[PDB]
C-alpha cells in the first residue's frame with residue numbers, strides 16, 4: 001500500500017489550479033478537464049483547487065470499493081445556493097439537503113411513496129396522460145407548418161414535459177404547460193423554476209453568502225424563484241386539506257399518512273421536483289438527438305415498441321416490461337451524457353484504491369463522464385449502441401442514477417416517464433437530424449449542448 005501523499009495529480013498547486021480554473025472558461029469544461037486528468041495521471045488522481053480537494057477514480061471496480069465505505073448516512077457535495085436559501089428563509093432541509101440519521105429517517109418514509117413498485121404502477125397512468133398530450137401538441141405543430149414536417153429545437157418543450165410530468169405525480173394536478181396558452185399561474189411558475197436553475201449555476205463555486213453580502217441580483221433572483229416554488233407547494237397543501245373535509249400524488253399521500261411533519265413534507269416535495277425537471281428533459285434531449293443521428297437505432301426501438309403494443313393489448317404495465325431495448329437506450333444515453341459528471345461520497349473509513357491509502361473523511365468522486373467515454377471500459381464508446389446493455393450481465397457501469405441507499409429516489413419515475421415519452425413519440429413520429437453537423441457538449445449544472453439542437457419530426 002502506497003501512501004496518500006503519492007497519488008498522482010496536481011494537488012500540490014491548489015492555488016495555481018484555482019487561478020487556472022477562473023482565468024478563462026473552466027466552469028464550462030469540467031467534464032473535459034476530468035477526461036485529461038484521467039488520461040494523464042491514470043485510473044486515479046488527486047485534485048486540489050483552492051479549498052476543494054478530492055480523489056477521482058474511473059474504473060467500475062474502484063467504484064464498488066467506494067460505495068462499500070460510504071457509511072450508513074452517505075454524504076455527497078452540497079448545493080451551496082439551495083442550502084443558503086433554506087437557511088435564509090428558515091425552511092427545513094429536504095431529503096436532498098439532509099444528512100446523518102435525519103436523511104435516513106426521511107429517506108425511508110419517502111421511498112415508500114416515490115420509488116416502491118406499489119406506487120410506480122399508480123404513476124404510469126398519470127405519466128402516460130402527459131405523454132399523450134405531448135404527442136398531441138407535436139401533431140398540431142406539424143399541421144401548422146405543413147408538408148408533414150416540423151423542424152424545431154425541442155429544448156423548451158421537453159423542459160415543459162418534464163415539469164408537467166413531475167408535478168402531476170408530486171402534487172396531483174396538471175399545470176397545463178403543454179397548452180398553447182397556459183394559465184398565468186403556471187407560466188410564472190415555470191419561469192420561476194427556470195430562473196431558479198439559471199441562478200444556481202453561478203453560485204455552485206461562488207459562495208452564496210458573498211453574493212448576498214453585495215446584494216447581487218443573482219442572489220435576489222434565486223430567493224424570488226424559490227419563494228414562488230415554495231408558495232406553489234403551500235397552495236397544493238391548502239387545496240388538499242380542503243378536499244380532506246382518489247388522493248393521487250406523493251404530496252397528498254404523505255399528508256394523509258402524516259408520518260413526517262408538514263414542514264419536512266414541504267421541503268422534500270420541493271427538492272423532488274427540482275431534481276427531476278432539468279435532468280429528465282435534458283436526458284430526453286440527448287436521446288432524441290442520438291436517435292436522429294443514428295436512425296438505425298430509432299427503427300429498432302420503433303420495431304420493439306410497436307410489437308410490445310400488440311402483445312400487451314393496451315396494458316401499460318405489461319408493455320413497460322416488454323421494452324428491454326428501450327431501457328437499454330436510456331442507459332446508453334446516460335453513458336454518453338450523464339446528468340452528473342461525477343458521483344461524490346465522503347469516506348467514513350480508510351480504504352485502498354489502486355494500492356493507495358485513502359484516509360477516512362476524504363471526498364472521493366466517480367467520474368461518470370470519463371467512464372462512459374473510455375474505450376477500456378466501453379468498446380467503441382463514441383457509438384450510440386443500446387445493445388451493449390442487453391443480455392450482457394454491469395451495475396457499476398450504469399451509474400447514471402447513482403447507487404446504494406442514497407441513489408436517485410426518482411429513478412423509476414424518470415425511467416417510466418422517459419419510456420412512456422419515447423413510446424408515444426416513436427409510435428407517431430420519425431426524428432431526423434436537420435444536419436449531421438457535430439454538436440459539442442458543455443457543462444452547466446448538467447451536460448447541455450453548446451448550441452441548440454434542431455430536430456425534424458415527421459408523422460409515421
Ligand code: HEM
Pocket residue numbers: 076095096107166271272273275276277279280283334339340343344399400401402403404406407408409410411413414
Ligand atoms: C434522467 C433523469 C434523472 C437522472 C439521470 C437523475 C440522476 C440522479 C443522480 C445521479 C443522483 C445522485 C445519485 C447518488 O448520489 O448516488 C440523483 C439524486 C436525486 N434525484 Fe435524480 N435523476 C433523474 C430524475 C429525477 C426525478 C424524476 C426525480 C423526482 C423526484 C429525482 C429526484 C432526486 C432526488 C430527490 C435526489 C437526491 C436523493 C438523495 O440525495 O437522497 N431525480 N439523481
Ligand SMILES: CC(C)CCC[C@@H](C)[C@H]1CC[C@H]2[C@@H]3CC=C4C[C@@H](O)CC[C@]4(C)[C@H]3CC[C@]12C
Pocket residue numbers: 030077078079204275278279339340341342445446
Ligand atoms: C443529486 C444530484 C447528483 C442530481 C442532479 C442535480 C443537479 C441539478 C445539480 C445540483 C448541484 C450540482 C452540483 C454542485 C457541485 C458539484 C461539484 C463539481 O465538481 C461538479 C458539479 C457538481 C457535482 C454539481 C452538479 C449538478 C448538481 C448535482
